[PDB]
Design a protein around this ligand. Structure first.
Ligand SMILES: COc1cc2cc(OC)c1OCCCn1cc(nn1)CCOC(=O)[C@@H]1CCCCN1C(=O)[C@H]2C1CCCCC1
Length: 128
């Protein structure tokens, strides 16, 4: 399924090229402009432990997830990943624990040394 496809086919978008964040564009967006650091960003997402079935979904809360880009309000993989996305794009991310919740994890939702998968739709973004 989706996680294995990102392992096999995803682009490494880390600076270090450690395969810590892998991305596939699943639907192309429009802009030739990505959000910049500090921007207010609006997304829908579905997220799960890479080995794991049950998703966490913004849809469950009946509203978009909103955060300021590059301010560490989200895991590092999101600050890296969403900075590469255009408005309307849907991307898949597969994330090693170094770019997510590391050795400590974040219980009870995330255990130690967890790989995460996300599908993210970039809905909108506005400058600070
Ligand atoms: C670690 O706590 C959660 C993690 C996630 C979902 C949660 O609730 C729906 C979590 O409870 C906290 C309340 C909501 N929240 C999260 C964040 N800010 N607010 C930022 C920390 O989260 C993140 O940076 C990432 C990316 C942005 C969406 C949420 N997110 C998560 O890591 C999810 C987890 C995805 C993998 C499966 C378990 C939830």
């Amino acid at each position: 399924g989706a996680p294995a496809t990102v392992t096999e086919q995803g682009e490494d978008i880390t600076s270090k090229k450690d395969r810590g964040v892998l991305k596939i564009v699943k639907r192309v967006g429009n802009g030739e402009e990505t959000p910049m650091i500090g921007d207010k960003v609006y997304v829908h997402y579905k997220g799960k432990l890479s080995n794991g079935k049950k998703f966490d979904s913004s849809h469950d809360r009946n509203e978009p997830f909103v955060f300021s880009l590059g301010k560490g309000q989200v895991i590092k993989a999101w600050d890296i990943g969403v900075a590469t996305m255009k408005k309307g794009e849907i991307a898949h991310l597969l994330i090693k624990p170094e770019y997510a919740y590391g050795s400590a994890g974040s219980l009870p939702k995330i255990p130690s040394n967890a790989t995460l998968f996300f599908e993210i739709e970039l809905l909108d973004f506005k400058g600070e």
